[PDB]
Amino acid sequence: MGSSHHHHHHSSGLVPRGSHMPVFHTRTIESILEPVAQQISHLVIMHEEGEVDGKAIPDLTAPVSAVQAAVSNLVRVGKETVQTTEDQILKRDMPPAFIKVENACTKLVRAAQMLQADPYSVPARDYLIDGSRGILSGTSDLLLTFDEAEVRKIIRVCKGILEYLTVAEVVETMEDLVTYTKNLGPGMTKMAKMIDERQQELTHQEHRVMLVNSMNTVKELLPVLISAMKIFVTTKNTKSQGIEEALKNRNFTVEKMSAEINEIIRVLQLTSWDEDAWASKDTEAMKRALALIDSKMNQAKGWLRDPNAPPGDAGEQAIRQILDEAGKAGELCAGKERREILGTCKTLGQMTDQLADLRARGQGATPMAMQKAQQVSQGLDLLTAKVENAARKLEAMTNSKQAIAKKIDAAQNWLADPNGGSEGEEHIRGIMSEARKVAELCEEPKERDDILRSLGEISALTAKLSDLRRHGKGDSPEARALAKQIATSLQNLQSKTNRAVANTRPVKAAVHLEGKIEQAQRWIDNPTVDDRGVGQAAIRGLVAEGRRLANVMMGPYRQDLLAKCDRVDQLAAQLADLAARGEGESPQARAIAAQLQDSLKDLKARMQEAMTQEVSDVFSDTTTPIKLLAVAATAPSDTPNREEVFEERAANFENHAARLGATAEKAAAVGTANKTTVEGIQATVKSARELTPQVVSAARILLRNPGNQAAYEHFETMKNQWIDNVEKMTGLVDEAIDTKSLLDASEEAIKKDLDKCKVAMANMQPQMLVAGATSIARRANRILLVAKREVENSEDPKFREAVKAASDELSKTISPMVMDAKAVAGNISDPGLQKSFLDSGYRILGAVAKVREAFQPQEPDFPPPPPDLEHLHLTDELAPPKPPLPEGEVPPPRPPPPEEKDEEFPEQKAGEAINQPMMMAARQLHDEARKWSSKGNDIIAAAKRMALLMAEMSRLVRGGSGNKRALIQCAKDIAKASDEVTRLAKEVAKQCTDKRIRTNLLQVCERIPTISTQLKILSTVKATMLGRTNISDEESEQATEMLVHNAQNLMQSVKETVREAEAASIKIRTDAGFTLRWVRKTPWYQ
């Protein structure tokens, strides 16, 4: 190849974008590559038709022509694209892509002519895989470039309205305001329109939701940004004191919209899986932790200030709340920024025990004990401030990453197309600028110091390049030969930078509870790679939620909860030590797999149980507080205490709203829900936190302006936009708790809260009636809401009507506590209080309990059958002779078929070379489908085959033979299986009367047709790259990662179709056709 002595040595410049991923992230791209790879697999199985038999590879002027015919049209506009429209990045990128296309469909007709002439020809079996792969890589890169532009149009339009929200600060005159709407309007419909059209085209749903959610927030925040500018221009007069509550209600609206438009822009440039999501998740979580602390700080800084000793439940559990929530934040840190923060938690954790013991000893004013309570006060300051750090460092570190990305666009347009000017130069100053922010918000000696080196060297080159341009030499064999050298190090910058982001995110776990159990419950497999990591790191954040949950409880339950937390942790730290010994081999570690795997299963039941109570209490009244800020802020007339009363009602509203979100997370964290209802609830919780201040600012603007409507306009727009989050918060929270068990807690709550009305008279208070019917008012109104949700959700008229009935016989029974406790408010007129109050009020609890029974089994009855027929032993005399006049007589014959078996796993190990994640993907689907009989049940049947082929593909990858034709069939079979699962999973859902069960089943099983289509393409590829050429062998190492993470998804997404399919099996229609057989596998059901 190297065509001279001197020059061909330095020239390492075929290096713009020459080792790229394949992409199938749009319906167009998927539709093109699906057949291309279909066609190209033949020629990768014909290339193996000169190995097995070593035989002649037939006439290819028909196959390789229809191959050419496929990607012919694609360049017949792909050349007509590049010269026509003035796209700069399209121009330099479009050709070297389709130079590899035509390279192929040429290089397949050169090697076709080698075998058309000589059907035995190895100079073409040299150049067939190099010729094939080309057309795959080529068209991938060709279709990709074509798309990157369709996106660039959009990010353009978006970046525009990002820049146009800035000019919100330059808007003073009501005259100008409505001309802002005039010229914002048209440029938002085109964005929403551009986005909506683009989402349709997307394969990864994961993405389509982040888009669809983000752009909706944007729409619910014009009605607000519109408002906020009007109450900023309304307040331009000598009578407008608190003028800036508007300005910050208005800049909240501009920041959040801007953080959504940015989230949209980022999500749009996604071509594959998403690694940068997690940093916003954790960043949110710490804001959530900090917030909860911020609230409970002074409520327990007064604990330490005060010598007087109440060491129990009042504001000691206020201090340990902080220390749990700051412990939870430190968890989401990595390295030793984590170890410090948790290190401070266990120090100030024992200093409190030191004190709390000393407070029982009356030692409140002892000179060491006052001093020690001083230390904890200074401790919480430091710990709150050290979490406030790690929090904004994680946001700042990612904001810098998201900032480097949207610039490297035009930074590569400056660095090659050798003019740019001032306009282009700033794009590489800008990226260098951020690399320094990473390094100073990094916390290692050697991690920052390596970046400052890279930054120090791109500094020198970029100064040299800059001055050559300036002293003419901009067009020269030094102005390109160097400016080459830079784009190399400017890629190296994103390495050392992105590596610095990835070193501040720790071994992550499931966001939902039932996920976190699997990641742990999957220590039936005691020895494995990075399950020392994630297997503990779930169990770690499961007990750390048990601990978090017990620290806002009564002392009896509390220690009862921590007793389980500490004995589970103990049986897990046991096999943590036991497994590492040599292996946690079957004998001893069986003893824990009966105790811990069943113990950990009760800790859940104790966490949910409790969580169910804290939701039953806290969510009973979502509105009283902000409904008291309405009547407070309105201010019936004038008593100057108004300000201080509005504060106490506005503080009650912040105290309470903070509680709702803190509980809302606690249900997301520990309950029923999928990852989707958990994420749902969290966005809710994030908006409650954000909006709460924003309402009270508008609620202030009302106190200072008695008579204004424009103030009342902002109140109701904010007041409702906070409710429209809460009513939603409450929708996603009940959905994530057992309804049967919610109705228990709430019945038990109405019982206890009835007594407080019985013994409101027996004590004698007239309002403790009305406060003990603030409960049974909103509580009984909540049990009707919870049943109104379930009837909207069901399609089983037999259930639907039994609960629509027990609803009736309670909705009316709001009388004998509204206009009944209203009558005898003050009265103790014994006969005329209790004759209608207790009588009809305890039949209210009788109705509640009929509503409960409407959920309890409809079809099945109480007494089952025990069949004990004492089989005796009266012997049978069936004596066998053979008769005289005929000959040869016996029972029937035996054909080939068997008795019964079931093909369990070829669990490969002992000096074998496999893909360790791929097998571990395959062994996990098996485990789930292994549970169930495959006998009336092609879904389990399929699932079991799918996970068998995915163990073959695990052994059909590493090293590898001349079995490329095998890897094509293995992945061909896997696709065909998956299509059966999808066939059946749809028929199940279609028969299922529970809509949340149905919908969440279609959502996990409609992933599978695409995922398997991709797995086919990746399999047709990697085949072509199976131990071949030397430059090939650094692509064939990164190209597994895609296929690996693509196999992980299929096994996971099929595993959840199996479960949800069985789930949706149970609640099936009355006269329903399709039903598969769900029977757990026993010794007696194989």
Ligand SMILES: O=P(O)(O)O[C@@H]1[C@@H](O)[C@@H](O)[C@@H](OP(=O)(O)OC[C@@H](O)CO)[C@H](O)[C@H]1OP(=O)(O)O
């Ligand atoms: O290898 P692919 O992934 O493309 O699989 C295609 C599928 O339609 C598959 O179901 C096969 O169905 P088929 O019904 O054509 O099976 C062959 C048989 O009828 C006579 O030998 C195709 O052979 C097969 O298409 P083909 O006709 O190009 O071989």
